[PDB]
């Protein structure tokens, strides 16, 4: 096939998928809304987050923090969100009695495959969590398809959901 | 009157916004089929300086670094299977980067590199980085003003910006594959 | 014009003799470092975080501390509460208010260690406040700091024979080799 | 029996500074090998190649150092010399096949290999081997022309600076026209 021909055909399609696609979150099941009301409740409470994704995903925990932090804060409050698998108390259990020793009231909010045992170990613990997963690991989590070809919208779409949730309920346009 | 805003409950606001969401996402999915050419030809061009041998060097702008971590882990995933280790660089990183002297970034750049291209995603947010980005080496600019005729135009202050990062990523990549595996002849 | 190899063999030579020459340097040293090491390994013992910043320059020697402290092998060791400042979303670039409010509320027990220049007013007013610090500073700030010249054409040395006394006073408490 | 602190600091850092002293003659009493392949990696600067620096992980530190010090944040009248992260790099071997070498053989103009410490994967090994030039400061003697660094020595931290020092004066000594090489 010819470039010109081929990429005309691939952008119709491309961009059909994603209308096709678009209402995904008004058929998904897993709680996300209880998630996101829980993470809010804690970030209210003065909680920090403790953000780590899976190798694939650092891009998306680069996302977070910058989405969260952003260099110019104008109004907005500086939000306590720690690189998690930038902390020299990463898993690779002394890491889980260091992190509560060290954080006053600290949430794991991870995304995406657990890809060691020591992070499992640690986000199987009782302190509070967000898990955005690929399978359940016990509590609700938030559920995504691995191998969904989409999946990189639907995690910015996600955070762009937490962000307004947060927002709406921090100058007071929603109540929880 | 016309009254203040109440407040809505926390589970009934989600739900609107969720779907109101989607449907906007759905309403602008169409975006690129109605654009007006152009941007074929640019990726067609950065895909024959890969072709040739050529580097890319890729900026971007402090909003932007998480697209930059994107485009390096995409071009050249964990696992290559059996895929090229492709002449990606993240020049936002390099000793390269200017501050202002582009003239010296410039020139040992041109010394470094065999043959690099400039891959430039957002605000150009120093006079040195304008000056490289203006210079005769081959570039792929996707900006937010029109520096040059050749650039990829975004929509700065679009809501839906990020996801056509994404989607410009993806038409690239797959672009870039359909001929480096001779499915498409350019 | 020298040759090359007859320059080396005097730079080679001359270099070494001015190491020698000042290696006694600490013996001398007025600052209370010696203070400074008890009340920064208390902290530690206590619980305490360690939140870590350095200038521009000493990039370099902010990631000696954290590799050395926390080694990428444990081994028998204790995994010990340090961050890295200069990384963190709460480093005061403007403004320092915010910083110290979210820090505190953040960490349980944080002291400041700053290695360098101040560079911006945000740091100084954190570096200022309430919270402990351990300053590692080229002209005292505050309370005692431990002082290092700035244009030292050895300075780097001394960063490392300073870290590594204070390492090996940590682990002397920590062991039970040495009571404070 | 236990140490007060105070006593036990003093003696301590007595104790250090000697043994620097006692040490600082080291690199006076090598053999000057080292001094060769310092000038040949100046000549591989002037020539107008580059150096991918790279180093084990106890030594990130020190790559910091090397990146840091050639090119620093104040230039003044100083080149922008030719230095890359090669740790950082996407070229960096993991695996790979010698996808990394053929890489970095096209993408750079002229690539010398600048590697400190251990070497901590087959891959780089194969690299480091390669007829690419090199600049190696390792631990056991892997070629002939080598810096050879004494991997349990309590001052190494101190002999890597001091031979940082030593390089940067002899580079800009020579790019300077300050000796003849
Ligand atoms: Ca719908
Ligand atoms: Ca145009
Ligand atoms: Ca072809
Ligand atoms: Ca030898
Ligand atoms: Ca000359």
């Given at each position: 096939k010819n470039f010109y021909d081929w990429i005309k055909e691939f952008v119709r399609d491309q961009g059909?998928?994603?209308?096709?696609?678009?209402g995904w979150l008004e058929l998904e099941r897993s709680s996300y809304a209880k998630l996101?009301?829980?993470?809010?409740?804690?970030?209210?409470?003065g909680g920090s987050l403790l953000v780590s994704a899976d190798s694939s995903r650092h891009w998306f925990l680069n996302y977070?923090?910058?989405?969260?932090?952003?260099?110019?804060?104008?109004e907005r409050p500086l939000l306590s969100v720690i690189d998690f698998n930038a902390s020299s108390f990463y898993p690779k259990n002394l890491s889980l009695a260091t992190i509560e020793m060290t954080y006053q009231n600290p949430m794991f909010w991870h995304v995406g495959k657990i890809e060691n045992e020591g992070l499992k170990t640690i986000l199987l613990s009782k302190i509070p969590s967000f898990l955005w997963l690929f399978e359940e690991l016990k509590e609700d989590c938030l559920l995504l398809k691995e191998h969904d070809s989409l999946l990189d919208y639907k995690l910015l779409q996600l955070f762009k959901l937490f962000?307004?949730?947060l927002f709406s309920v921090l100058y007071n346009k929603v109540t929880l």
């Open positions: 059909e998928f994603i209308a096709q696609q678009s996101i009301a829980q993470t809010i409740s804690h970030v209210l409470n977070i923090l910058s989405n969260l932090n952003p260099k110019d804060l104008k962000e307004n949730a």
